[PDB]
Every structure is written in structure tokens, then in C-alpha cells.
Ligand binder design. Structure first.
Ligand SMILES: [Cl-]
Length: 105
């Protein structure tokens, strides 16, 4: 599929800034349950337009790599994430999204 821009935002629970962490050492887990969010310091949300991509695992991975980088920039030691898709018809103007919760040890 063609390259498309992956946008990301970090949504902190609190105003204090934490020292950045090394993104390669962020621990990454699947977000499986509501209770998994307990204790998080904030959320990371990323998204990429679908365009002509047919491999949606690649779009989820693209979202995840940006989410890891962004969460690490804001001090995360761990993220728990899920990739999300439109409930309606997917087309080239659709977006694949990721919701991640960031944690500090
Ligand atoms: Cl990991």
C-alpha cells in the first residue's frame, strides 16, 4: 500500500511532565479488558488513513510504532493498546486507529 501519514496525540491525566524514556525499552502489551486501564498516566491515540492498503496488520503496526515513540517521549515505561476500525464501510478515506494507555513503573 502507498505510504500515508500517521497522526498521533498524547492525552495526559496530569500536567506534570516526565523525563522521556527509550522507546525501544517500552513494554508493549495487548489491551484486553476494561480493568487493564487501571493506573494509567495517560492515553496515546494514533491513526493512519487506509488509502489502498489491504494489509491491515501493517496499518495496526504502523499505528503501534508511532504510539510507542510518542508514549516514550512522554515518559511511559509500558503501553497497553488496541487497534480499532470503522464500524461502517471501510474505504480509501477511512482511518485505522489505535488507543493506547501509558503506564509508569
Ligand atoms: Cl515488549
Amino acid at each position: 500500500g502507498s505510504h500515508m501519514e500517521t497522526k498521533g496525540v498524547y492525552l495526559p491525566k496530569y500536567s506534570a511532565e516526565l523525563p522521556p524514556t527509550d522507546p525501544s525499552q517500552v513494554r508493549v502489551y495487548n489491551l484486553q479488558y476494561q480493568s487493564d486501564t487501571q493506573g494509567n498516566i495517560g492515553q496515546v491515540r494514533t491513526s493512519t488513513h487506509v488509502s489502498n492498503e489491504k494489509d491491515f496488520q501493517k496499518l495496526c503496526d504502523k499505528n503501534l510504532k508511532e504510539a510507542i515513540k510518542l508514549a516514550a517521549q512522554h515518559g511511559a515505561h509500558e503501553i497497553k493498546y488496541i487497534c480499532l476500525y470503522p464500524e461502517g464501510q471501510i474505504n480509501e478515506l477511512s482511518s485505522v486507529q489505535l488507543r493506547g494507555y501509558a503506564f509508569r513503573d
